[PDB]
């Protein structure tokens, strides 16, 4: 039905500008108010603004007025959030939200777009297999995974078998290495009996470095 798809994760320099997109499918946005909110570690969830794509009327939080500009293109069923003069404090996950008005609050949310404001350059991760072995099996179950090492900035997305494998998956929080680069691991437990007939592929996306890797994790 209705699905909100936002643009990919970004890494922006201080004082630069970025334009985030929120494309709606399965619903003409002329019947909606489109919202943008951000999430920060301390400030929590913060309302940014709202647009009516039927007429273009916008209502902003006066704290971000001037720095944020929301537009909409009804032809593409897409709303935009333009951020100007980005400061280090603007690092956040930016959500777009859609509401009709009968139940009358943001009932459909996008997946969010992580924006990191930094002067450091992006780095693409290496993806190494964590192969199932006698040292990762017990009780008929086998643990396997992928090590996503040395990247900047967050986030990295990890799926298994293009999303078909979700049970028993653990994608751990990233750790900050001394170099300022991040590392994370993603693991899954599977039957040891079917390691010879099933195929396990971790799909790793790091948008700021255009990294898209499908690593097959083979036993032994």
């Amino acid at each position: 039905e209705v699905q909100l798809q936002q643009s990919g994760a970004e890494l922006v320099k201080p004082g630069a500008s970025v334009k985030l997109s929120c494309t709606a499918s399965g619903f003409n946005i002329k019947d909606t108010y489109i919202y943008w909110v951000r999430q920060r570690p301390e400030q929590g969830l913060e309302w940014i603004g709202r647009i009516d794509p039927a007429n273009g009327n916008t209502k902003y939080d006066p704290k971000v007025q001037g720095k944020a500009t929301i537009t909409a293109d009804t032809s593409s069923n897409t709303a935009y959030l333009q951020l100007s003069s980005l400061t280090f404090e603007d690092t956040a996950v930016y959500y777009c939200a859609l509401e009709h008005g009968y139940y009358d609050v943001m009932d459909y949310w996008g997946q969010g777009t992580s924006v990191t404001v930094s002067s450091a350059s992006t780095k693409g991760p290496s993806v190494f297999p964590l192969a199932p072995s006698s040292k990762s099996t017990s009780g008929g179950t086998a643990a396997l995974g992928c090590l996503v090492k040395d990247y900047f900035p967050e986030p990295v997305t990890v799926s298994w078998n293009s999303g078909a494998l979700t049970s028993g998956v653990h994608t751990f929080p990233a750790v900050l290495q001394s170099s300022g680069l991040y590392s994370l691991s993603s693991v899954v437990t599977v039957p040891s009996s079917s390691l010879g007939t099933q195929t396990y592929i971790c799909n790793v996306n790091h948008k700021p470095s255009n990294t898209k890797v499908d690593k097959r994790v083979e036993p032994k």
Partner: protein
């Protein structure tokens, strides 16, 4: 500056109990208050509108109440899937404001971790680096200690670890620890081990391998 204050930053409950999340409005907002549920790694999901009206598909266990400045989200018959952060929000006057959020923690029985170890991949070794990963799966409570030992020598300053959020199905935690050495230092030793201490274990559990099978 209509401030939505949620005084309870965290709340501990058990599967089947009842928990009430409070939301304090600095000004009168009548019943123009909504409640959201933010599961880990997911987008916020709208639970209640108009202070007390649940959404289509929301279970009857989520009940909202309140008027004016005092609001309450009640979760009866708490399920393990209810692990999330719960946010209140007023939409009575611009700018709309959200509460600080309340994290729901679920207490369960003690569970010892399953401990697994992964040698460095051949792919990484050709790159000149060797990472060894120790995995602690599905334990409770969250507190656990991992110690790396190389040739029976306790390691210090060359490892990083992180713990997951509570699992939405069994309320356990998982932990992954990575020991990273240069390939030259890795090939200098033989036995790599992570020693795990946890409340569910009567003695430390050692998971090891010998470099070279």
């Amino acid at each position: 500056d209509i401030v939505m204050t949620q005084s309870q930053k965290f709340m501990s409950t058990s599967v089947g109990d009842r928990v009430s999340v409070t939301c304090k409005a600095s000004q009168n907002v009548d019943t123009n208050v909504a409640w959201y549920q933010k599961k880990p790694g997911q987008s916020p999901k709208a639970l209640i509108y108009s202070a007390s009206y649940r959404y289509s598909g929301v279970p009857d266990r989520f009940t909202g109440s309140g008027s004016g400045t005092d609001f309450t989200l009640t979760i009866s018959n708490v399920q393990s899937e209810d692990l999330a952060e719960y946010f209140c929000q007023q939409y009575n006057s611009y700018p709309y404001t959200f509460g600080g959020g309340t994290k729901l923690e679920i207490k369960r029985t003690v569970a010892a971790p399953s401990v697994f170890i992964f040698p460095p991949s051949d792919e990484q070794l050709k790159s000149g680096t060797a990472s060894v990963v120790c995995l602690l799966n599905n334990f409770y409570p969250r507190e656990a200690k991992v110690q790396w030992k190389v040739d029976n020598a306790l390691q210090s300053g060359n490892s990083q670890e992180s713990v997951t959020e509570q699992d939405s199905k069994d309320s356990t935690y998982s932990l992954s620890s990575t020991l990273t050495l240069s390939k030259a230092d890795y090939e200098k030793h033989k036995v790599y081990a992570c020693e795990v201490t946890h409340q569910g274990l009567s003695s430390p559990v050692t998971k090891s391998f010998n470099r070279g099978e």
